Amino acid sequence: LNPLSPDIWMYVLLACLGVSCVLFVIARFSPYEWYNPHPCNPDSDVVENNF
Amino acid sequence: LNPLSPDIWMYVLLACLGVSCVLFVIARFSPYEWYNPHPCNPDSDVVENNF
């Protein structure tokens, strides 16, 4: 742990978590991520995001 | 950026754009840059190109 001051570590973790929340609110609230599931899919209608 | 002339810092990004666009253009006029949708059915088009 030594090379980094005992503050950034916490900054690191909090930034990780805040970024993650941003990511997920982007994905489940997005006009694109919603996806056709079937490998051979003939325009189904049970699409959804994958996050 | 300190041990780095920003001239490099911009050369890199212009190179990024150049390689990306030229790569995609190469992809379009390519024989092998076409995958088949719904591979279980061979009778369709091959518009799937992955670029």
Q: How many CB atoms lie within 10 A of CB A27?
A: 14
Give the determination technique: cryo-EM
Closest CA to B37 of B23, B51, B24, B50: B50
Rounded CA separation B24/A14 (Å): 38
| Resolution rounded to one decimal, in angstroms | 4.2
For residue B22, what are the CA distances in angstroms to A33, A51, B14, B27, B32? Answer: 27, 32, 12, 8, 16
Query: Which positions in chain A touch B41 (Cβ < 8 Å)?
Result: 40
Query: Would you say the C-alpha torsion A8, A14, A17, A20 has a positive or negative sign?
Result: negative
Measured between CB atoms, does A40 come within 8 Å of chain B?
yes
User: Could B41 and A39 be called an inter-chain contact, meaning their C-beta atoms sit closer than 8 Å?
Assistant: no
Residue carrying the six token digits 């973790």: A13
Buried b (16+ CB within 10 A) or exposed e, B5-43: eeeeeeeeeeeeeeeeeeeeeeeeeeeeeeeeeeeeeee
